[PDB]
Ligand binder design. Structure first.
Ligand SMILES: [Zn+2]
Lengths: 41, 174, 109, 132, 144, 85
């Protein structure tokens, strides 16, 4: 999908709730890499 | 532009790292080229009879020498947008040893081209790079303009692969 | 009068083709550079930039070339004769064509 | 002056030492005939100093132009020789003039400095003004 | 997508989300190119995303040691004011930023008391909690 | 004009040469309804542009062919008086 609007209605509708969760889950400096659950469109 | 429900920036077609071909070059410089005279005259569909790599080479080969390494930015950009075959890159690189005026300014053109293409067919690309290293050892001299600076192929190839930005276009690390 | 009411209700062309195809010669209509010339775009203004395909003349360069890059001018250019503008690479393209680029390049040089 | 002496020297360097010059001063209402000679030092100066050389002209100084003896008479008359092309003034023909080059010559009547034969470029520019 | 949907293609978004036009704008163009503070704000938050995720990328990438990573995040979250323009599009963020600087100073003291002064102060926790407590408030605003 | 001639003429009011040329510059081109080829620079661009109105002011006074060539006719007058020191 790198290179339909009706399907992007809700996806574009809530961007920032994803910014919240992601910025909330930041790997802490004592943790190399963090596996995380993801709900994607 | 396109009328309905979307506006497509430039052509932005095809392939080359899963997103788009024209994304390799910034919007500002890309629109400087697409708004430049040379691009609208000697290139694209009406000049090249649609996308044609060999006639695209007819333009650059057709161009003391007047062409200095604007025109280079443009011809490189159309090389990008057309995106010919890596095999054709191999031939165009290694053929025609019976004439010395053929690859003159084509060297750094086919070079910066593959420099923009991909970062790691893979082994063939690596052979292309090490061959470009051999030509960096070939001790060649050329002139370049934006000011005026003459630079040696050994300095521009090594300084280019080691350097982030080249003549305004950024590069990634292979 | 009746005819009026009804209306209300070669090789040189190939040379013209050879002109409007190669731009390097077409690029320059500016040979006058800075010069004073004494005398709805249709059938030419007797000045400006000449497009014979659609019979329009354009006072500026970006309009003359931009119109040429436009589809309609290409559609008319094709409807004149053929469709080369729309016209793979099975290696014979760069082998034979590229070899013709070296050969013709040496011929010109 | 320098532009004159250098030219004199270039013409007559090894050819004739005692040849003279007629410098005609011209202004509206009257003209004046100022004749001059040249010594052997001026030829050397012209040989060395051709292009520019304003300071060495200053040092050159009034010397050496010795005032030659010239007379003006109605008791004799004379004639002109002109080049075969009959264009002596190459002002606007810049490519055709050659400072050392051979030309055929003939007797005839010379033309005006600005005359139709000497100004051909103007006609192509004149008709080119309207164009076509 | 939203910019092209707006019908203007000449506003360029950097991959860092910095918005700059392609060419100079006429009086008519500027008015049409003006977008609400909502959009600019969302862009700024996506620039937070881009900055911190860039830092962690260059950590996973072999560029930088972990110390300069934690100093990286720290520098971001405290330096938001100079390094990002959220305060312009919503000024109530200054309460956050002013609070971020405050905790900032505190940490530096407790961190820099014996050792000295300079870069390398870690412990980005409190300013980061401040920012999460900013998002939880400003999310319904931008979603709406 | 007969009255103003017998008595005043408004102190014989004549707009001077200045006021004439400036009255020309002020006046609009009476009837609003040549072409010159020029090279012009758009934003970050160079474009050949056809121009209009008046660029046509030209000086070329004492120089080139015209003034000296016209001045050449008077040269027979320079030999009426001829003298040398
Ligand atoms: Zn046309």
């Amino acid at each position: 999908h790198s290179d339909d609007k009706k399907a992007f209605l809700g996806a574009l509708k809530y961007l920032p709730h994803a910014i919240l969760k992601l910025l909330e889950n930041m790997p802490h400096p004592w943790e190399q890499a963090k596996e995380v659950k993801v709900l994607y469109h | 532009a396109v009328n309905e429900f979307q506006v497509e920036s430039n052509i932005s077609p095809k392939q080359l790292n899963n997103q788009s071909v024209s994304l390799v070059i910034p919007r500002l410089t890309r629109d400087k080229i697409h708004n430049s005279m040379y691009y609208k005259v000697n290139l694209s569909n009406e000049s090249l009879r649609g996308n044609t790599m060999v006639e695209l080479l007819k333009v650059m080969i057709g161009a003391h020498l007047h062409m200095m390494v604007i025109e280079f930015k443009c011809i490189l950009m159309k090389l990008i947008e057309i995106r010919p075959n890596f095999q054709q890159l191999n031939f165009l690189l290694n053929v025609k040893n019976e004439n010395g005026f053929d690859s003159k300014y084509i060297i750094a053109l086919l070079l910066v081209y593959a420099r923009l293409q991909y970062y790691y067919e893979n082994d063939l690309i690596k052979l292309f790079k090490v061959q470009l290293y051999k030509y960096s050892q070939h001790y060649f001299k050329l002139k370049s303009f934006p000011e005026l600076c003459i630079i040696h192929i050994d300095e521009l190839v090594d300084w280019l692969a080691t350097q982030d930005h080249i003549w305004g276009i950024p590069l990634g690390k292979c | 009068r009746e005819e009026y009411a009804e209306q209300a209700r070669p090789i040189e062309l190939q040379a013209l083709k050879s002109k409007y195809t190669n731009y390097d010669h077409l690029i320059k209509g500016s040979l006058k550079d800075l010069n004073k010339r004494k005398l709805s775009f249709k059938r030419g203004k007797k000045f400006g930039f000449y497009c014979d395909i659609c019979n329009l003349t354009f006072k500026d360069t970006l309009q003359y070339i931009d119109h040429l890059n436009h589809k309609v001018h290409a559609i008319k250019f094709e409807n004149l004769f053929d469709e080369p503008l729309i016209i793979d690479v099975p290696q014979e393209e760069f082998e034979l064509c590229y070899h013709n680029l070296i050969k013709d390049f040496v011929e010109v040089r | 002056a320098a532009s004159e002496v250098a030219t004199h020297s270039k013409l007559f360097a090894d050819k004739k030492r005692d040849c003279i010059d007629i410098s005609i001063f011209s202004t509206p209402g009257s003209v004046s005939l100022s004749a001059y000679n040249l010594t052997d030092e001026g030829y050397q100066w012209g040989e060395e100093n051709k292009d520019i050389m304003n300071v060495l002209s200053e040092g050159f100084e009034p010397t050496f132009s010795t005032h030659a003896q010239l007379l003006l008479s109605d008791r004799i008359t004379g004639n002109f020789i002109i080049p075969s092309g009959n264009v002596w003034n190459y002002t606007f023909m810049g490519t055709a003039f050659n400072q050392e080059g051979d030309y055929n010559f003939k007797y005839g009547i010379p033309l005006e400095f600005y005359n139709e034969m000497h100004r051909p470029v103007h006609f192509l520019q004149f008709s080119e003004l309207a164009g076509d | 997508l939203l910019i092209h949907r707006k019908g203007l293609t000449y506003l360029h978004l950097d991959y860092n989300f910095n918005l700059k036009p392609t060419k100079t704008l006429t009086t008519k163009e500027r008015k049409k190119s003006r977008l609400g503070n909502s959009f600019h704000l969302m862009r700024e938050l996506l620039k937070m995303m881009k900055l911190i995720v860039d830092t962690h990328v260059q950590f996973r990438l072999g560029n930088v040691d972990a110390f300069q990573l934690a100093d990286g995040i720290h520098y971001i979250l405290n330096h938001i004011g100079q390094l990002t323009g959220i305060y312009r599009y919503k000024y109530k963020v200054m309460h956050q930023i002013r609070a971020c600087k405050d905790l900032k100073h505190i940490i530096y003291y407790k961190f820099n008391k014996n050792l000295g002064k300079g870069p390398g102060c870690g412990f980005w926790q409190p300013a980061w909690r401040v920012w999460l407590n900013f998002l939880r408030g400003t999310i319904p605003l931008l979603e709406r | 004009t007969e009255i103003k001639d017998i008595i005043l003429g408004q102190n014989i009011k004549a707009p001077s040469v200045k006021r004439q040329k400036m009255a020309e510059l002020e006046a609009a081109r009476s009837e609003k309804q040549m072409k010159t080829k020029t090279i012009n620079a758009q934003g970050e661009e160079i474009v050949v542009v056809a121009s209009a109105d008046y660029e046509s002011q030209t000086f070329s006074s004492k120089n080139e062919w015209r003034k000296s060539a016209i001045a050449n006719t008077l040269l027979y007058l320079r030999l009426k008086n001829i003298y040398v020191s």
